């Protein structure tokens, strides 16, 4: 996964979390393994649209990626009734997913280091070696 | 005698004329006449609301009926 | 012009008919002179549309004309405040009139016999003699 | 006239058309003139518009045509105030009318037998004698 | 007519028709002489489109016919204050006539027998006899 | 026709076709004659449509012009005061009757055994026996 | 000027004149000279759409020009608070005007005699002399 | 048909079902024949659009089919008042089906095992054997 | 300047230009250089449209312009707060002065004496001598 | 199935699950056949658009098939009264796997391992072999 609950965390404050986690729960203390079943979900959702330009799994996160993935799995948590702003947060998340898929925006590189993930190759052609080039230089 | 009907009909196209729903009994007696005498070099004036057109009733060439007269011949 | 006072007075109620003349007038008592007046406004509005396909003055007077004049001779005497029902029926008239201006409609022959007003040529064209027609026959 | 006053009396309560009459005659017995004035002005439209495709007068009136005259004289009578009924089946009748005059619905047959308005030619052309044709047969 | 008065009726309580009747005739006792009238005009208001494709009269009535009469004859009674399900139907029947005189659709055989009304021909071409033919099988 | 008084019966309470029918009766006793009428009008209505593609009377009924019958005679009874739930369902119907018309969509099949109803020929073409063809196999 | 302050005083009454006329005046008596400005005033503002077409002055006065001068000069006398219909009017005369001018629609001729008033040539066109016409009759 | 009574009873309750059989039947003992009927009608409805692509009846039934038949099932029981819901289940149906129809979508297979049902050949080509191909390998 | 204070004050009442005044001037007299000020604004503004087609100054001045000259002062001068007839007139005005400027329409002449402003000349062409046409008459 | 009745009552909680299974079950105690009745229907949803691609059964599942079923079953179940929120992920699911079904984006691949299911060609084309192409090297 590309967060773990500590970023969830992080994010949003401890009470909400485990007020969402109280009724998934079957005791009364809250468990955080419906929060790392969302953050999967999130993953495979982002995952989704990366797999049409970058190999996966990725070589390099790109550090926004954890971010869109929080979006995301709050967004799922946050099913039996979801604010404005959540959904208009995770409409643009998914909007720049789209983006991302289609090559109209980059995902960007870690800011350790410049590092893009690495990819297929999107272009490729194919043809016979080219006799009577230029290169020749034979005549 | 399918060639001498053809060139009867030939290089001249029939003059329509286009009035208004609303033209008077008299108003299409006169474009009427008016359209039978174009020739020459002829002017005219003509409504908005009318038009005219010319359109061709025969077109061609005279090689399909000459290579069958003359193969008959 | 194509209506009097009396056609007037036909349609509409001599008491509306001398109340429009309240005011005008001078003296306390009615005046139709604003009346004819306004019927001669109305004939040479209704002429302005009719001069483009006849010759004025008509030779033969359609029946419809009559009431297209006494319309708009009472809108135009209803201007101080006119109502819905007026308006509509005077911008009606006048839409049938730019109709017959235009030529998508006919005015009419009058009811008494089949006759439509004499009109000029709307289509004319020159040319010189046809010489070498087919009506010739010398050849 | 396309219509009577009795015919008018069968669509309408004599009492209503006594009402409407009772302003626009001089005493108080209701007249029945202004009514037929209303008629002529109503067959006088109808053939503003007949005038189109068939010749005037008609050869055979169209059974339909009474009852579009009737409809319009109303109306006209009903001046002062119309009613949103009597303006909107005005309204159709005029639409029928144009129609008809465009020539896109037939007018009719009256119902009595099967015969259709006499009417001049739509559409004529003219050309010298056809020479050449197959229905010489003489070469 | 396409229907009775006794076909009237069947579709609407012979009590609305009454209270329809009572001011249109000059005595007390209900008359259907205006339920005939309203159901020739009818008639002749569906021939007006029906002369399109069928010569009229009609070999055989097609059975929606009746309904279509009664419908249109409602609503011409119903003139004083038409609701909005009577309009809404009429305007229904009309845009149905329309559609059937341009062709769009059929008006339908009787349920009797399967048998369509005659009509002329819509389409005809005219040409010389055809010589030099493959079925001349002369040379 | 394509459904009797007792299928009507099966979608619709008995009660509230004896209601319908309690004032076009002339007795106290409910009739179902009406209800016969209706469903010939409705079987009519719906030949109307079924005959541009299949010939009639069809030689097998598909089973859902039993309730498309059903549907448009409940719709042409409750005439009075239509619902906005069974005039949506007529016009549903009316559409649906339009697309089998136009040839946008099958009748069906009868459930009992898989048969369609037999139809004339939509479209034809003409032309002389075809001599050097390559089923000669003479040269 | 086209019309006088007795028309206007014919078309609106004396005390409406006299109300406009008392703030524009010194003393306490009503003036005229305003109504005469307003009018010279309408009187330019209507030459000024008829040179177009006709040369200045105009040789013969058309009726309807009197009507629109007090129409236009109404509504110039009324700019303190002008009311819907009497803008309404002035939109409707500028309209025309309008019209008038791009030659949409003709002026009219006066009622007492059938004149149009003079203008330039609104198309003229220049050419040597054509010799080689059929008119030579010379060969 | 695709589904059955007790298949309707799983998605919806008795008492709801027994509900709408209260009125339908003439006695107090609720009655799924009715039910019956509007599951053949659903099973009609579903292979008039399902016709266009597959051989009916189908070999294999796609698991989705019981679903739909039940919704529009539904739908007709609830023909005296529809709500929202359900009305918005039943066009969402009908438009799956219209999709399925013109192919823009697959029916699915059933899941037991994987199996499509069969089909007629929706695109057919014809021609004479072909000689002089490169198959020919005799040259 | 097109228009002195005394044609201001023939328009507008000299009670309301002395309000106007009021608070403009230093001492408790109403001064009228400001009202002079407004005048030279508005000749400037209108000359800024005369100057496209027509050479300045004007050689004889147009009546209208006066009153437009009047329009736009007084607009100018009710800064402060502007009622709607007085910006609808000052737009109609700009709009007027833009129409002349693009040649849409006529400024026209002086009332006293058919003379229109002279102008620069708008179309120019320039070439040589025409040798070699036909009316040389050398060969 | 692609989820389990334990994945549904992740999502969800077990209280809500066993108030929907409340009338469904003809006993008391709740039952999750219904349940497991939504999950197959769901799973089959699914199928019927990732037949387009993919062959069936799937080799590998992907990760967000789970959560996609899990929520168009839970729509499945709120029939009776749907929320805005759950209609709307519903639409937002269904609009995902028409996505997936147009190609227009990538399901995606288990988290577990990197691996794509298998899907037949979706491209094919056919030619004879190819002679004289510049791999025969004979020349």
């Known amino acids: 996964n590309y967060a773990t609950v500590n970023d969830l965390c992080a994010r949003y404050t401890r009470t909400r979390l485990d007020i969402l986690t109280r009724p998934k729960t079957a005791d009364g203390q809250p468990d955080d393994a419906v929060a790392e079943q969302a953050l999967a979900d999130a993953s495979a959702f982002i995952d989704g649209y990366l797999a049409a330009r970058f190999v996966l799994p990725l070589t390099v996160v790109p550090s926004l990626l954890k971010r869109q993935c929080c979006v995301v799995a709050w967004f799922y948590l946050n099913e039996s009734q979801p604010t404005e702003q959540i959904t208009a947060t995770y409409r643009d998340t998914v909007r720049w997913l789209e983006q991302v898929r289609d090559g109209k925006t980059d995902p960007g590189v870690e800011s350790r280091t410049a590092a893009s993930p690495e990819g297929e190759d999107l272009v490729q052609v194919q043809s016979d070696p080219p006799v009577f080039s230029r290169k020749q230089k034979g005549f | ?73």
Do not use: C, H
């Open chain 2, 1 to 73: 005698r399918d060639f001498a009907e053809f060139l009867e009909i030939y290089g001249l196209p029939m003059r329509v004329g286009k009035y208004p729903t609303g033209s008077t009994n008299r108003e299409k007696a006169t474009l009427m006449q008016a359209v039978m005498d174009i020739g020459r070099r002829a002017g005219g004036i003509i409504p908005m609301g009318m038009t005219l057109d010319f359109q061709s009733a025969a077109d061609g060439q005279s090689d399909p009926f000459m290579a069958m007269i003359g193969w008959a011949e």
